[PDB]
Design an enzyme around this catalytic site. Structure first.
Site, PDB file in Angstrom:
ATOM      1  N   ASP A 271       0.830  -1.199   0.000  1.00 14.71           N
ATOM      2  CA  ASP A 271       0.000   0.000   0.000  1.00 14.71           C
ATOM      3  C   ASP A 271       0.871   1.257   0.000  1.00 14.71           C
ATOM      4  O   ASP A 271       1.957   1.259  -0.599  1.00 14.71           O
ATOM      5  CB  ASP A 271      -0.949  -0.062   1.208  1.00 14.71           C
ATOM      6  CG  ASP A 271      -2.265   0.642   0.966  1.00 14.71           C
ATOM      7  OD1 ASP A 271      -2.278   1.893   0.923  1.00 14.71           O
ATOM      8  OD2 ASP A 271      -3.298  -0.052   0.850  1.00 14.71           O
TER       9      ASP A 271
ATOM     10  N   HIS B 181      -3.762   5.994   3.842  1.00 11.97           N
ATOM     11  CA  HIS B 181      -4.526   4.826   3.405  1.00 11.97           C
ATOM     12  C   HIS B 181      -3.900   3.526   3.905  1.00 11.97           C
ATOM     13  O   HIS B 181      -4.595   2.668   4.468  1.00 11.97           O
ATOM     14  CB  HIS B 181      -4.624   4.878   1.879  1.00 11.97           C
ATOM     15  CG  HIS B 181      -5.423   3.778   1.250  1.00 11.97           C
ATOM     16  ND1 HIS B 181      -4.848   2.592   0.849  1.00 11.97           N
ATOM     17  CD2 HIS B 181      -6.721   3.719   0.858  1.00 11.97           C
ATOM     18  CE1 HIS B 181      -5.765   1.832   0.278  1.00 11.97           C
ATOM     19  NE2 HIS B 181      -6.910   2.489   0.273  1.00 11.97           N
TER      20      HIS B 181
ATOM     21  N   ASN C 246     -14.109  -0.242  -6.318  1.00 13.20           N
ATOM     22  CA  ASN C 246     -15.135   0.691  -5.862  1.00 13.20           C
ATOM     23  C   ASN C 246     -15.922   1.313  -7.009  1.00 13.20           C
ATOM     24  O   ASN C 246     -16.334   2.474  -6.941  1.00 13.20           O
ATOM     25  CB  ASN C 246     -14.545   1.792  -4.983  1.00 13.20           C
ATOM     26  CG  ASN C 246     -13.688   1.249  -3.867  1.00 13.20           C
ATOM     27  OD1 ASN C 246     -14.041   0.262  -3.224  1.00 13.20           O
ATOM     28  ND2 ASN C 246     -12.564   1.908  -3.610  1.00 13.20           N
TER      29      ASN C 246
ATOM     30  N   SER D 177     -11.168  -1.168  -0.041  1.00 16.32           N
ATOM     31  CA  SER D 177      -9.870  -1.117   0.629  1.00 16.32           C
ATOM     32  C   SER D 177      -9.986  -1.399   2.115  1.00 16.32           C
ATOM     33  O   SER D 177      -9.006  -1.818   2.737  1.00 16.32           O
ATOM     34  CB  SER D 177      -9.247   0.273   0.511  1.00 16.32           C
ATOM     35  OG  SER D 177      -8.740   0.535  -0.776  1.00 16.32           O
TER      36      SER D 177
END
Length: 279
Positions: free
Chosen positions: A39, A69, A161, A224
């Site tokens: 990530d 994130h 998404n 996520s």
């Protein structure tokens, strides 16, 4: 063990019903397992990680998470308050820059890095990788995820998404990894969650409280956020000896809460991750 006033997603994964707020789990808590969070990085100094997080690789000028994130996702895997597997070891691999973007070539290199790097780590109960990232279909990205899984790592990836079929996104569309859709606190498919036959499981993904950079916390939404619930659950179940890296996605689907989600399109699994812990 019981954690009162837990984030709803943690309570959900240990419950046969929505609408409760205590998380119940075996005290082994993923001890002896390892989860790689591939990530934007992890703020390992966050008190919530208790010294159990570290950066092991970056492709950029720093290994620090300048975005948040990756820290949020790592918190859902394994932070003391916000995490599923509260005693796992967390390893950060920074394939995404501080704007949250990354080239597929870097992402592929990061997956192959994890497949090798696990041989430099102590993970007697097994190894998981959480990939809260993706873009358009790429056979090379899917192949890299397949290699990582083949090497003996439980790979969990975000479905995406786009409120669309995940067949058109990578690594979501790779059959051999665990592709994770998102649900909300009322057991509805999250409004943004991708769907389709390639999904293996749903996890909590709307309004998920976790760690953030600057030693903070915040609630955000996405597939996520659902992915690290499943990654942490896998680590927890592997520590318990109930499953292995090669079989954990199937085991999670076998033992999921079934038929409880709304707005699941015909042909997509109606399965919600569940630890089946009996206190």
């Amino acid at each position: 063990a019981a954690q009162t006033n837990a984030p709803w997603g943690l309570a959900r994964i240990s419950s046969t019903s929505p609408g409760t707020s205590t998380y119940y789990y075996d005290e082994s808590a993923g001890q002896g397992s390892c989860v790689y969070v591939i990530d934007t990085g992890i703020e390992a100094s966050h008190p919530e990680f208790e010294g159990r997080a570290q950066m092991v690789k970056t492709y950029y000028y720093s290994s620090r998470d300048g975005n948040g994130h990756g820290t949020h996702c790592a918190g859902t895997v394994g932070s003391r308050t916000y995490g599923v597997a509260k005693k796992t070891q967390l390893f950060g691999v920074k394939v995404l820059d501080d704007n949250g973007s990354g080239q597929y070539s870097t992402i592929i290199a990061g997956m192959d890095f994890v497949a090798s790097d696990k041989n430099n780590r102590n993970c007697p109960k097994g190894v998981v990788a959480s990939l809260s990232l993706g873009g358009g279909y790429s056979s090379s990205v899917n192949s890299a995820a397949a290699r990582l899984q083949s090497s003996g790592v439980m790979v969990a990836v975000a479905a995406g998404n786009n409120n669309a079929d995940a067949r058109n996104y990578s690594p979501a569309s790779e059959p051999s990894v665990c592709t994770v859709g998102a649900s909300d606190r009322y057991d509805r498919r999250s409004s943004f969650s991708n769907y389709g036959s390639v999904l293996d499981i749903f996890g909590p993904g709307t309004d998920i409280l976790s760690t953030w950079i600057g030693g903070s916390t915040r609630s955000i939404s996405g597939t996520s956020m659902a992915t690290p619930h499943v990654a942490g659950l896998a680590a927890y179940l592997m520590t318990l000896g109930k499953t292995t890296a090669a079989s954990a996605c199937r085991y999670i689907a076998d033992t999921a809460n079934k038929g409880d989600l709304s707005n699941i399109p015909f042909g997509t699994v109606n399965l919600l991750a569940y630890n089946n812990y009996q206190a």
